[PDB]
Design an enzyme around this catalytic site. Structure first.
Site, PDB file in Angstrom:
ATOM      1  CB  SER A  42      -0.958   0.081   1.294  1.00 14.09           C
ATOM      2  OG  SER A  42      -1.636   1.093   1.146  1.00 14.09           O
ATOM      3  N   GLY A  45      -0.924   4.529   1.379  1.00 16.37           N
ATOM      4  CA  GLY A  45      -0.941   4.648   2.992  1.00 16.37           C
ATOM      5  C   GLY A  45       0.506   4.566   3.655  1.00 16.37           C
ATOM      6  CB  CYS A  46       4.075   3.647   2.298  1.00 16.40           C
ATOM      7  SG  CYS A  46       5.778   3.722   2.884  1.00 16.40           S
ATOM      8  CB  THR A  47       2.703   8.400   0.598  1.00 16.33           C
ATOM      9  OG1 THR A  47       3.369   7.486  -0.436  1.00 16.33           O
ATOM     10  CG2 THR A  47       2.849   9.692   0.265  1.00 16.33           C
ATOM     11  CB  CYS A  80       6.270   5.040   0.254  1.00 16.89           C
ATOM     12  SG  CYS A  80       6.437   5.596   2.104  1.00 16.89           S
TER      13      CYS A  80
END
EC number: 1.11.1.24
Length: 155
Positions: A42, A45-47, A80
């Site tokens: 993901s 989501g990481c970013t 990310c």
């Protein structure tokens, strides 16, 4: 009390920084440590989780904490990692840290059961006690929640 007991050896597992060098949890002894784990699959989501912690980093610092983000390098975006967070990201190459915190879980990915990281965060005291845990984290509001928990424990 503590909410989780870590094997002591966890503290000297060599952890690979995204830049190539190494660190360990022992290196953070003497201040509070937020360790957040994120899944590789993901990138958005990481970013977002990383940018949220990055924005709060000065507040974490004033409250006496450092942040470590952890995932596991996998052949199966770089977006990310290319963001440039002002806290370290580590690649847990053999999942030793992940397994110590018990964040590796089975997921169904379009039929296929696979192993992956369950997004999770832990707050460690200056002496290495795990004082609070969050598992299967919803990113919205999470970095704020962790900062609030840190201030409640440290102040």
């Amino acid at each position: 009390d503590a909410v989780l007991e870590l094997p002591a050896a966890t503290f000297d597992l060599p952890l690979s920084l995204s830049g190539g060098t190494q660190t360990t949890l022992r290196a953070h002894a003497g201040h509070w440590l937020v360790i957040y784990f994120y899944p590789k699959d993901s990138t958005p989501g990481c970013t977002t989780e990383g940018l949220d912690f990055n924005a709060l980093l000065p507040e974490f610092d004033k409250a006496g904490a450092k942040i470590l983000g952890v995932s596991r390098d996998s052949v199966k975006d770089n977006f990310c990692a290319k963001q440039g967070f002002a806290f370290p990201l580590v690649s847990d190459g053999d999942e030793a840290l992940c397994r110590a915190f018990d964040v590796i879980k089975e997921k169904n990915m379009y039929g296929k059961q696979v192993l992956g990281i369950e997004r999770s965060t832990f707050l460690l005291s200056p002496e290495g006690q795990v004082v609070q845990a969050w598992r299967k984290v919803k990113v919205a509001g999470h970095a704020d929640a962790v900062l609030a928990a840190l201030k409640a424990h440290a102040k």
